[PDB]
């Protein structure tokens, strides 16, 4: 019955946490977040929720190289969520990058209380930069084809974004103002609307 399905649900949850844990242990940030996104999208469908995980997690560890990288996360997807909020949109991009540090958490929540502290190695950094074309290539990959953040094809304006970035680090001129110029842009000096083409 329902009870004895929802066994068999957390068995796969289980299996679907440690996959993201393991993408998170080797330093891959898209690849965890696809994971991530993995697993919260069976925990929501199945009506599953962090606590309903994490009792059968105790014979697993996020380390403190992993809190390192889901703090860094964190921060990075904070300041673009809010960043990307602007007077020409400010619902489909936030949004999409909030998304992200909510799912991020439900990972981490899982094994953790929320009421109960993360223990990061506070020598592990990831570049910010990293962090945030792992963001958006994430986004990019989720996305359906059609979706669009203001008049622009969001897949092509994660892919102009993320462009943006790697030039930066190429030129070594990687600040937060330079990212904020890119986080906050909705392109609009662009030279027409870009598509899913």
């Given at each position: 019955?329902?009870?004895?399905?929802?066994?068999?649900?957390?068995?796969?949850?289980?299996?679907?946490?440690?996959?993201?844990?393991?993408?998170?242990?080797?330093?891959?940030?898209?690849?965890?977040?696809?994971?991530?996104?993995?697993?919260?999208?069976?925990?929501?469908?199945?009506?599953?929720?962090?606590?309903?995980?994490?009792?059968?997690?105790?014979?697993?560890?996020?380390?403190?190289?992993?809190?390192?990288?889901?703090?860094?996360?964190?921060?990075?997807?904070?300041?673009y969520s809010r960043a990307a909020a602007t007077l020409t949109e400010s619902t489909?991009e936030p949004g999409?990058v909030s998304?992200?540090?909510?799912?991020?958490?439900?990972?981490?929540?899982?094994?953790?209380?929320?009421?109960?502290?993360?223990?990061?190695?506070?020598?592990?950094?990831?570049?910010?930069?990293?962090?945030?074309?792992?963001?958006?290539?994430?986004?990019?990959?989720?996305?359906?084809?059609?979706?669009?953040?203001?008049?622009?094809?969001?897949?092509?304006?994660?892919?102009?974004?993320?462009?943006?970035?790697?030039?930066?680090?190429?030129?070594?001129?990687?600040?937060?103002?330079?990212?904020?110029?890119?986080?906050s842009?909705?392109?609009?000096?662009?030279?027409?609307?870009?598509?899913?083409?």
């Amino acid at each position: 019955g329902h009870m004895v399905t929802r066994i068999e649900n957390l068995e796969n949850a289980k299996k679907l946490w440690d996959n993201a844990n393991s993408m998170l242990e080797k330093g891959n940030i898209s690849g965890y977040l696809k994971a991530a996104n993995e697993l919260h999208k069976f925990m929501k469908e199945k009506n599953l929720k962090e606590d309903d995980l994490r009792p059968e997690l105790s014979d697993k560890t996020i380390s403190p190289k992993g809190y390192a990288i889901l703090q860094s996360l964190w921060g990075a997807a904070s300041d673009y969520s809010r960043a990307a909020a602007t007077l020409t949109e400010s619902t489909v991009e936030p949004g999409l990058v909030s998304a992200v540090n909510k799912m991020s958490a439900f990972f981490m929540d899982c094994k953790l209380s929320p009421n109960e502290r993360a223990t990061p190695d506070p020598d592990f950094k990831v570049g910010k930069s990293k962090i945030l074309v792992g963001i958006m290539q994430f986004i990019k990959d989720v996305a359906d084809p059609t979706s669009k953040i203001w008049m622009h094809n969001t897949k092509a304006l994660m892919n102009h974004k993320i462009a943006a970035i790697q030039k930066l680090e190429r030129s070594n001129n990687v600040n937060d103002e330079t990212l904020e110029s890119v986080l906050s842009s909705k392109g609009e000096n662009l030279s027409e609307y870009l598509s899913y083409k």
